[PDB]
């Protein structure tokens, strides 16, 4: 029902490659789940430290 597929190389890939560019991310401002750097651009200091 929620059967989803990944390999270990592809999964380690998208674990590494999720913050810098993201295919699922919205590339137009004003939409949710934007690029991680743009989300950081408005993030709070506590938020960014949790990211660290």
């Amino acid at each position: 029902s929620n059967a989803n597929i990944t390999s270990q190389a592809l999964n380690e890939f998208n674990m590494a490659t999720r913050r810098l560019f993201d295919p699922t991310a919205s590339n137009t401002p004003g939409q949710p789940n934007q690029q991680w750097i743009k989300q950081i651009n408005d993030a709070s200091p506590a938020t960014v430290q949790k990211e660290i």
Binding site: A43, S44, P45, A46, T47
Partner: peptide, 30 residues
């Protein structure tokens, strides 16, 4: 009796501290 301007100045100043501390806490993200 006429009100001393010190009291009104302090009341306005206190409202500014309240507003500005809420803004700073907002900027921290809280």
């Amino acid at each position: 009796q006429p009100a001393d301007p010190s009291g009104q100045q302090t009341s306005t100043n206190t409202s500014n501290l309240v507003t500005y501390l809420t803004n700073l806490g907002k900027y921290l993200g809280y």
